[PDB]
């Protein structure tokens, strides 16, 4: 079996700059004077999309900012200039011999200006409380870079247990990331306290962004 080695695993490229993704075959993927390797793009929640076939042939409808090069064992994919919509995972594939094999993938991160999150806190709904549950939701939206930490406080005291976090993939339009933090409590524990705080700490500020509500 031919092994397709992709490098790097990930790379961050500034908007308008050039991105070069490498892909190496363990044996020649050449036949009939052509290189039997191809490049695909996969965006979150979508099937892969073929960009280039036979190392350098651009697919119909794909921008000329994408270029493939190489022969035998060494291949490259070039994106120049890098655009926001290019935030995806790129795969190379060989079909010179059976079984057809893919590379591990390269995640392209689009590097934009720093942006602080837009923090929103939501109390448990009446519907949830009538069924004995209490989830406190906090959204930390449209920030850059991806690194952020959330701290929950119940009447000023930190709470680590019962907190579930989830990050989105980089936005294909504005190159930001968003995150949701959910604090789940029993209806009983929720009803015995008043002050619920969601504190976000991001590169953009030394002070934490603090959103809260009182159960009153």
């Amino acid at each position: 079996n031919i092994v397709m080695t992709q490098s790097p695993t990930s790379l961050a490229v500034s908007l308008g700059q050039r991105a070069t993704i490498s892909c190496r075959a363990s044996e020649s993927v050449d036949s009939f004077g052509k290189s039997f390797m191809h490049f695909y793009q996969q965006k979150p929640g979508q099937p892969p999309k073929l960009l280039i076939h036979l190392a350098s042939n651009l697919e119909s409808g794909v921008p000329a900012r994408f270029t493939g090069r190489g022969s035998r064992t060494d291949f490259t994919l070039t994106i120049d200039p890098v655009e926001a919509d290019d935030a995806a995972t790129y795969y190379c594939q060989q079909n010179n011999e059976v079984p057809f094999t893919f590379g591990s993938g390269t995640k392209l991160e689009v590097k934009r200006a720093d942006a602080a999150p837009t923090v929103s806190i939501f109390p448990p709904s009446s519907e949830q409380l009538t069924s004995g549950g209490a989830s406190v939701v906090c959204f930390l939206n449209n920030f850059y870079p991806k690194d952020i930490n959330v701290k929950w406080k119940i009447d000023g005291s930190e709470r680590q247990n019962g907190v579930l976090n989830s990050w989105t993939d980089q936005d294909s339009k504005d190159s930001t990331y968003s995150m949701s933090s959910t604090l789940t409590l029993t209806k009983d524990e929720y009803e015995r306290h008043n002050s619920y705080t969601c504190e976000a700490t991001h590169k953009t500020s030394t002070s934490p962004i603090v959103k809260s509500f009182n159960r009153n």
């Binding site: 036949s31 009939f32 052509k34 039997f36 079909n95 011999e97 057809f100």
Partner: protein
Amino acid sequence: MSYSMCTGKFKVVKEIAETQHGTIVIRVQYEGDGSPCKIPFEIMDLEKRHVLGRLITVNPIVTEKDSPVNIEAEPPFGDSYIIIGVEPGQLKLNWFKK
């Protein structure tokens, strides 16, 4: 020509036969949708590392879909692989010459 390679499958219509000149003849029929396209053809050693014989048919092309194409080639002496079409379903035929 100018035409790109056929992307589809081939069917053997006439199996390899040796001529009086020591050459080989094969007839393949295209099954895909490339309409006029060049037939991918190559002769290799058993390890698929070196290209060996020469094509006698100058640039074999599929003219019509359901019409066989004659291919004549001069294989090397001994064992070789006659390789036709792209993968999956690429034809890999064994041949021994003298």
